[PDB]
Design a protein around this ligand. Structure first.
Ligand SMILES: Cc1ncc(COP(=O)(O)O)c(C=O)c1O
Ligand SMILES: Cc1ncc(COP(=O)(O)O)c(C=O)c1O
Ligand SMILES: [Mg+2]
Ligand SMILES: [Mg+2]
Lengths: 386, 386
């Protein structure tokens, strides 16, 4: 049937201004198809566990077991005997008191914020913190106060003005790969009587003792109120989790709308995560190699005069406007380097990022090639870098 | 660390008013543990497919295959070669032009509404429509105009007053099991130049030719703009889908925040759905049996004086306030009948429901037993039904 004018107008306008403008007629994030020979730096699977035979075996085994039909809200599954062992193990892993499974990192953040916020609750959020955190705050009708990226001085002034609130940060930032000043943030939380929420999606598994994370690495675990993470990065699974050093996870399952009104992870999924955790705990070798390759790439690109703000395995090439970003993308892909285009609504219109996500399967030769491709891009490329 | 007052006060109040007041000290939804002999009416797996040997085998096999590391946004996977066969099959199944997979039914609704709504778009939503639709409208900053349940007069008045917009309904309602007046809603949409969105979460698989849904059953497919569904009901899988009789699914992947910022389903998950679809297509006998059992139950309960608004496999026992609901729940569970308590925020505080979700494994003896238990419950004097 015919669409009403206001919907048709929106779709017509969108296709013109987001698909039709680009050379290939597709959205800016969609370039050319990658060949087997190309270097792919797009996946969040940092320790290259997507195809791990032990994970696949345990997941298949658990699925083939007699399946109880648990197609329902997790609200109904909160009796002690119905809660999955993975929660207790992830809590022990990170050093937090309690863990609660969620269907996504997005839902973990939205759910936690809905539970701990009242309307007009002060939420002090890093300008570059994940969209799920910004949205979580917005859905709860909290008062969001952005602070300049990693700027503790700016943060202090905001809390001085508005009073006690929730300080919200990524441990490692999704677009830039910068690291939050977690120690200073803990100090500030104490200095002003705030709660701290740290999203460790990009540090859990890759950082800390046995991959326990950045809070564990810095010995700050017992001074942080909340941590969250997508399990779709290093844990290579479509899920999320909320950790609390308090009783909040007793309440989340009955308060969070995504936790109430969206279906639970099935029991076999929880079992697969148990194996993933064991593999991650022992993956000292992969973590070290990733760390070394990441440092090499950061040093190599910084030498070219490129702005590389990263301190991690996530490297952000800052490519300015969309037209320029299309050029940089086309050049890199033409020379066998496939990153991820980060544009609006993930960034502002004129501050786009081509994100290179490193994983432990990337070797010295590939690292050298990336620097080589970027060097030719700086010197011979008909485009700029911010 | 101890929580600051602004959180602690909320949590304290919540525990007091939602956990402490109940006899067992737990949330209202949490009763006693069921025995293997008990009648369990809690799962949305209407055709009892959770333990189907063929589905399990297809998933495990596709899981054990060589997996590509696709842990990223689905926006990066919108090339024709990256889009799954299940989407084309599901579109043919329902008779809709195009289908787009989502991570949940919740995400399907939230994403679609974000794509087709502008700020202040009129959204005419049934009082009892699923929370995901209410929230999808709220996130999009749409103007919600709630209409009395299944009340086309109230809807007509609202659209005359506020103008063209989007009419949003469940085909079969999640708490009451009532059926939307879909033919009349199609007429109203045409008369007033509105778009119609129908959530078929509770009719897809159970109703229509080969389980194609209620729109298909009524021959209304080609007159409806959008249909959505959780695949976590009859399809017994943690996913959702958006169907369009237009070009909107071209745009959803790049606009919807869950589609953009949350990880996609993996290829093996899609293959599992293909097998599930085939089984559902041929499950005529299961559909027929469920339909017969559900009618038998509604007849049996309604003659006892209970209000039973249902016309489907979802049967809502209307139990009034929370104190009454607790007593009803306890009686039913003590006598071997386990439904799901639906209370706030899913219902009003004084209009709680104990939902009986029937499935095709339920037999005549069990239906007779439920009727017997409720017959004795009516005469017991400890509580009431509405
Ligand atoms: C009518 C209706 N729509 C959407 C959903 C969302 O389903 P899902 O569990 O796949 O998120 C459900 C609730 O779970 C539902 O009952
Ligand atoms: C920092 C951060 N937090 C949370 C999420 C949400 O992850 P998920 O894909 O599991 O919804 C992501 C985005 O993918 C992320 O990068
Ligand atoms: Mg990310
Ligand atoms: Mg439901």
């Amino acid at each position: 049937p015919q669409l009403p004018d206001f919907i048709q107008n929106k779709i017509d306008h969108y296709i013109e201004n987001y698909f039709d403008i680009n050379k290939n007629g597709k959205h800016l994030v969609l370039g050319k198809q990658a060949s087997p020979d190309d270097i792919i730096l797009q996946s969040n699977d940092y320790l290259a566990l997507a195809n791990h035979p032990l994970i696949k075996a345990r997941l298949a085994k658990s699925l083939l077991e007699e399946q109880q039909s648990l197609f329902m809200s997790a609200s109904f599954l909160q009796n002690d005997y119905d809660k999955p062992m993975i929660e207790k193990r992830l809590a022990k892993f990170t050093g937090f008191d309690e863990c609660l499974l969620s269907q996504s990192g997005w839902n973990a953040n939205v759910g936690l914020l809905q539970t701990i916020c009242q309307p007009n609750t002060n939420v002090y959020i890093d300008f570059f913190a994940h969209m799920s955190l910004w949205e979580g705050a917005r859905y709860a009708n909290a008062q969001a106060h952005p602070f300049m990226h990693n700027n503790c001085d700016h943060l202090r002034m905001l809390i001085q003005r508005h009073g006690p609130g929730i300080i919200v940060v990524d441990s490692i930032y999704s677009t830039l790969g910068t690291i939050a000043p977690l120690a200073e943030l803990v100090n500030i939380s104490k200095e002003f009587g705030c709660a701290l929420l740290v999203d460790e999606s990009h540090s859990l598994g890759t950082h800390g003792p046995n991959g326990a994370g950045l809070l564990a690495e810095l010995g700050l675990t017992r001074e942080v109120h909340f941590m969250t993470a997508s399990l779709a990065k290093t844990f290579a699974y479509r899920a999320g989790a909320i950790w609390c050093n308090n009783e909040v996870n007793r309440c989340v399952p009955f308060i969070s709308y995504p936790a109430i009104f969206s279906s639970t992870l099935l029991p076999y999924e929880a079992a697969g995560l148990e194996t993933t955790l064991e593999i991650i705990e022992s993956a000292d070798n992969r973590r070290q190699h990733l760390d070394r390759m990441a440092r090499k790439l950061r040093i190599g690109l910084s030498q070219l005069g490129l702005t590389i703000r990263s301190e991690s395995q996530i490297i952000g090439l800052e490519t300015g406007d969309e037209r320029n970003t299309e050029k940089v993308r086309d050049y890199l892909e033409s020379n066998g380097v496939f990153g991820s285009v980060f544009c609006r609504p993930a960034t502002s219109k004129n501050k786009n990022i081509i994100r290179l996500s490193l994983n432990s399967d990337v070797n010295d030769e590939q690292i050298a090639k990336i620097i080589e491709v970027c060097s030719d891009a700086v010197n011979y490329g008909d485009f700029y870098f911010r």
